Each structure stands twice: as structure tokens, then as C-alpha cells.
């Protein structure tokens, strides 16, 4: 029977002859009995009761480390976990009909708009938010300007050493960062001084003057870009972060601004915003490179040739749609054009027999989920926060937000003092890592390892800090928090099968899109070497 054991059942299994019932044991039985009388309570209340039961059980095992009932109580703890999943699957509430996209730090491009429009076209019953920051359209411009200039400065120092094997990609990225870090410090010191002098100044005011003073950019041209950026986003369901009061007043806002203003990491700032948006409003978050799910039975008459993978086939399906329906102009066909004419004709025939977009892409419709959960997309590498589904104020959305805040607290506790010493990049790194390592233990070891690379994020190969800070790891940790009836998990022991309990159905997203499959590029050593080599070729052309 799937239902959680009752008091009498627990008494039997946790029975030890000749042992009196301790106060700590009775407490468990009492709470278990209370749980079974809670049929009229809310899901969250039921969960909190289960949490209390687990806590009381842990207190017993810790108090009487030798007790004969520990074996049975450990089995009981397993039953509690199963009950959480049962509670999750059996009590569903409607998901608010909102689609959330995020595009901050610069002008939204046409490709993003075209993808978003696909969702709009088949989900007319959904409100669409494309979150942007009206104060910070120039952050990407700033980063690109600083980085490009730094690349060019660095390569000039390589001029007489191009055949020297010591002047490798490693040296390049190291030397480049010395310059980038110095500029980042210069900028943030300027930002802080400007804010002190005139608190009415917004990010873009300070950035544009900085760009004019430091890199001879024209304020007039930057003003035009801001205007064009604002107009483009507001005409495409723009939702300004600067009007998101709950976000601005919460404990995540300073983390958002840390990433936006100090680190110029738009991906990380997006990570922080998206889950706060989902928590506060409810609905479905999507990356702008996701497309609506294909109708399940659309291509059932076409079977896959043996000379191609599932990933090749999935990409081909979308490319066929875009070739013959032209929903997105300029969509690739490189995978479709590799097929035999017999199957290309098979695609053309199927799609010709279809009239409306609603016959090709499915609609999200009435969705429901547990008040406990956030659902997440999966790819071949595991969970990925490119797709999220949650009811407003779901327990897990709260757990995820808290995971991210706690991770940043650990980071900033060591990072801020390190930075404040006002040394160069390498010295700051060493100070920071030494500080982080002093707080490392068996529980947080792998996490702390990645944290130590924070300042390298986006500028060096083999850096996974973001996923550990604001990305998938924080989500896995929240799921562990839920299933282990705790908060602040650092050591992820959950595996795929555990996480699949929270998966978004494959029918609800097309993940194998042109934009996505191009962004599965991983910045590893090989990629870094190739990038260095491309930079050198461009830079030294002529002689």
C-alpha cells in the first residue's frame, strides 16, 4: 500500500523488546499520528509536518546512537521521502498562465524576438513577460569595449614572440585578465564615486560617460542605442526589472546588481532574476533559444534512418518545419539537406497536408503542478534551467532562491575582503582562494573548488562557477533540500532518477533548436586555444 505507515505500523516495525518508549520516540509517534489527521490541511502544511517527523527521527538516532530501533527508523525515513513524492504527484494546482523570458544588459536581437513569437502564436491564453533593465542597456557594450581593447593590448606584447612556445593560450588569457581586472576596478571605483556624488544617476548614465572618457565613444550614439533598445523591447512584451518591487526589495537584488554592474555577467544576473520572477508570479520560464513542443504524432509516418542520432533527427524535424512553413526566416537547413530525397519528400508531403501552425506546434494549455515543486528541463548532461515551471510561491522556488542567496553569502564573505586589498588579479585570486579553502570541508569541497574560480568566470577555459552559484547545482541542492527535509544542502548525492521526479515533459519544449545547439559550445581548453589562435590571425594580418 502506497500510503505512509500509520502510528500502529511504525510502533510494530520500530519495536524493540525490553526497551521502554523514550520521550524522543513518543514524539515521533505523536507527530506521525498528527500527520494522518491532516487530510484537510494544505500541501505545504503536510510537507512541514513530514519535515517535523524527519527532524524528530534524526534527534532520536543522534540521542541513542546504539538503539535497536535505529534500523527501522532509517527505513521509516525512506518512507517519508516516498510520501513527499506521493504528496507532490497527488495534489496539483493550476499554473498561472505566464511565460517569462529575460533579456538584460543590451538590445534584444531579431532571432530572440522570432523565437518568442512562436510561443506567442500558439499560446494566446498566456501573458508574456520579456524582462529587461531600463537602467542598464549599455553593460554589454561596456564589457565588449573593455575586453576587445584588452585583447588588442595583450597581443601587441606577443609581437616578437609569435614562434615562442611559452606564448601559448594560457599566457594569453592570464595576461589579458590582468588588464580586464584593472579596468573592472577602475570602472567600479568610478561607479561608486559617481553614486555618492549624485544618487539620481542610473547605471547607463555612468557607463556612457565612462565610455566617452575612457574609450572616446560618442554619447550621442550611445543615447541613440539606448532609445532604440528601449523601443524594441517595450514593443515586444518588455517588463522592466526597475518596476519589479518585490525583487528590488529582496535579498537577491544586490546579487543581481553585483553580477550586472561589477562582474558584467549577464548570464548570472539572468539566473538570479528568472527564479525570483517565477517565485513571485508563477508560470513558465524559458530561454529565448527554446521553441514550443512539436505535436507528438506529427512525423509518425516518417521513421528515422539508421545513419543519424536522436539529436540529428530532432534538429531535422525543426529544420523541415522552417524550410516549408518559413515560420522563422533564415533558419538553418544544414541537417535537413543531408537527408535522402525520399525522406525530404516525406517531410514536404506531411507538412503540405497541414494548414495551421497549431497542427505543427503544441500549446501549453491548462498546466498544473504541486505547490511543493519547480519543474525543470533536462538534456543529455542533466537538469538545465533553460526551462522552468512553477506555481506562484512554490515551496521549491523559495528553496532555490535561498540556495542562491546562501551560495553568494559564502562567496562574498571571502571575496569582498580579498578585493578590498586592492591588489592585482593574480594576488587577489590567491588571497581569495586561500580564504575559501580555510572554510572547505567534506560537505562543500567540490563547490568551494569552483567558487575559487569566480573571478575567472567568462574569461578563462574550464570555469563552472556560475552553474555552482546561480545555475543547475543550486536547483539540485534545492531538490535535495526538499527531499531531505532540510535547507542549505551543499553535497549533492541525488542522481538522475531522483531529479527526474521534477522533469518538464518533453512534449512541452523543443530544445534542439538552431540557437540552442550552437550555444552548447563549452568553453574548454581546446576552444580557448582555438579562440587565441583566431585572435592572433586577425590581429597580425598583414604583418
Amino acid at each position: 500500500g502506497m500510503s505512509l505507515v500509520n502510528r500502529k505500523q511504525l510502533e510494530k516495525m520500530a519495536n524493540v523488546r525490553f526497551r521502554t518508549q523514550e520521550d524522543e520516540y513518543v514524539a515521533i509517534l505523536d507527530a506521525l499520528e498528527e500527520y494522518h489527521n491532516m487530510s484537510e490541511n494544505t500541501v505545504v502544511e503536510k510537507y512541514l509536518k513530514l519535515k517535523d517527523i524527519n527532524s524528530l527521527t534524526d534527534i532520536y538516532i543522534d540521542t541513542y546512537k546504539k538503539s535497536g530501533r535505529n534500523k527501522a527508523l532509517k527505513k521509516f525515513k525512506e518512507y517519508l521521502v516516498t510520501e513527499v513524492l506521493e504528496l507532490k504527484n497527488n495534489n496539483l494546482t493550476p499554473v498561472e498562465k505566464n511565460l517569462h523570458f529575460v533579456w538584460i544588459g543590451g538590445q534584444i536581437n531579431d532571432t530572440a524576438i522570432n523565437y518568442i513569437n512562436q510561443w506567442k502564436d500558439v499560446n494566446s491564453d498566456y501573458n508574456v513577460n520579456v524582462f529587461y533593465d531600463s537602467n542598464a542597456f549599455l553593460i554589454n557594450t561596456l564589457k565588449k569595449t573593455v575586453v576587445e581593447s584588452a585583447i588588442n593590448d595583450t597581443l601587441e606584447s606577443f609581437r616578437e614572440n609569435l614562434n615562442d612556445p611559452r606564448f601559448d593560450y594560457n599566457k594569453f588569457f592570464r595576461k589579458r585578465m590582468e588588464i580586464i581586472y584593472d579596468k573592472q576596478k577602475n570602472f567600479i571605483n568610478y561607479y561608486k564615486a559617481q553614486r555618492e556624488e549624485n544618487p539620481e544617476l542610473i547605471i547607463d548614465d555612468i557607463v556612457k560617460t565612462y565610455l566617452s572618457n575612457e574609450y572616446s565613444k560618442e554619447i550621442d550614439e550611445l543615447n541613440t542605442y539606448i532609445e532604440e533598445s528601449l523601443n524594441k523591447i517595450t514593443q515586444n512584451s518588455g517588463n522592466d526589472v526597475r518596476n519589479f518591487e518585490e525583487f528590488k526589495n529582496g535579498e537577491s537584488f544586490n546579487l543581481y546588481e553585483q553580477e550586472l554592474v561589477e562582474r558584467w555577467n549577464l548570464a548570472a544576473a539572468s539566473d538570479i532574476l528568472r527564479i525570483s520572477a517565477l517565485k513571485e508570479i508563477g508560470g513558465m520560464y524559458l530561454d529565448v533559444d527554446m521553441l514550443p513542443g512539436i505535436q507528438p504524432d506529427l512525423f509518425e509516418s516518417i521513421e528515422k534512418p539508421s545513419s543519424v542520432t536522436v539529436d540529428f533527427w530532432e534538429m531535422t524535424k525543426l529544420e523541415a518545419i522552417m524550410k516549408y512553413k518559413e515560420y522563422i526566416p533564415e533558419y538553418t537547413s544544414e541537417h535537413f539537406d543531408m537527408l535522402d530525397e525520399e525522406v525530404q519528400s516525406s517531410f514536404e508531403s506531411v507538412l503540405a497536408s497541414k494548414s495551421d501552425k497549431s497542427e505543427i506546434f503544441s500549446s501549453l494549455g491548462d498546466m498544473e503542478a504541486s505547490p511543493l515543486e519547480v519543474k525543470i528541463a533536462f538534456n543529455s548532461k542533466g537538469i538545465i534551467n533553460q526551462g522552468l515551471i512553477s506555481v506562484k510561491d512554490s515551496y521549491c522556488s523559495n528553496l532555490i532562491v535561498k540556495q542562491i542567496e546562501n551560495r553568494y553569502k559564502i562567496l562574498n564573505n571571502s571575496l569582498n575582503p580579498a578585493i578590498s586589498e586592492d591588489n592585482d588579479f593574480n594576488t587577489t585570486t590567491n588571497t581569495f582562494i586561500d580564504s575559501i579553502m580555510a572554510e572547505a570541508n567534506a560537505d562543500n569541497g567540490r563547490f568551494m573548488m569552483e567558487l575559487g574560480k569566480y573571478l575567472r568566470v567568462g574569461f578563462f577555459p574550464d570555469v563552472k562557477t556560475t552553474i555552482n552559484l546561480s545555475g543547475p547545482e543550486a536547483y539540485a541542492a534545492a531538490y535535495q533540500d526538499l527531499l531531505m527535509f532540510k535547507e542549505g544542502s551543499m553535497n549533492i548525492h541525488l542522481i538522475e532518477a531522483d531529479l527526474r521526479n521534477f522533469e518538464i515533459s518533453k512534449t512541452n519544449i523543443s530544445q534542439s533548436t538552431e540557437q540552442e545547439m550552437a550555444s552548447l559550445w563549452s568553453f574548454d581548453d581546446a576552444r580557448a586555444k582555438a579562440q587565441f589562435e583566431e585572435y592572433k590571425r586577425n590581429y597580425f594580418e598583414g604583418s
Partner: nanobody
Amino acid sequence: SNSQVQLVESGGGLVEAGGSLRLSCVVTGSSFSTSTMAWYRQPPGKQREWVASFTSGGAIKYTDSVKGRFTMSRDNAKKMTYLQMENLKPEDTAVYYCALHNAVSGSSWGRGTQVTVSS
């Protein structure tokens, strides 16, 4: 190479040994302020050689044979670079070219300006 960037060098000619000469280069396009500017020269019979560079970060370098004699400058507002040559020697005779170097948007070169030093 970046086709949207053009460079026009000027100021070359015939000059006496020990004399001074200033070359100029005007640059078009929008990459000047984030690029490195460089001067080169191709002496008769020999391959083109590097002379001087001035990075967008403000670093100046010179080839050894020219140190103490040549002065390179750059002006982001005017999008111009200059090579001031002093105490000119016969071995300085060459076609002098200017280049904008950019790893991101690409590099562009001028067609050069000839300098002949008498002796």
C-alpha cells in the same frame, strides 16, 4: 581584414641625412579607440619590417634601430597617428605603412608613403 576601415598615410618624400620628417595617417571607421596602431616600413630589396606601435591601452614600443630617434603618437578623437622621425639616416629609406590591428573586427593597412634619405 576589415573592409570598413581605411587608412591614408602622408608626409613622405626626399629628406637630407640628419633631417626630420613627420608622417601622418588618418583612419576611418569605429574601431580606432579599441585597436592597436602600428607603423611599418619596407626598405628597397628587403622585406617589410615593424617600426613602432601604440596600443589603445596607451603602451608605446619601438624597433631597436629607431629608439631615441622616432616618436609615435595617436589621437582617438581625430582618429590619427603620427610618426615623428628625427636624425634620419640613409638606412631609413623605405615605404612606410600604417596599420590598425584588431583581433575582433580585423586589421587594415594603408598603401604607404615613400621616404628617401639622401647620402
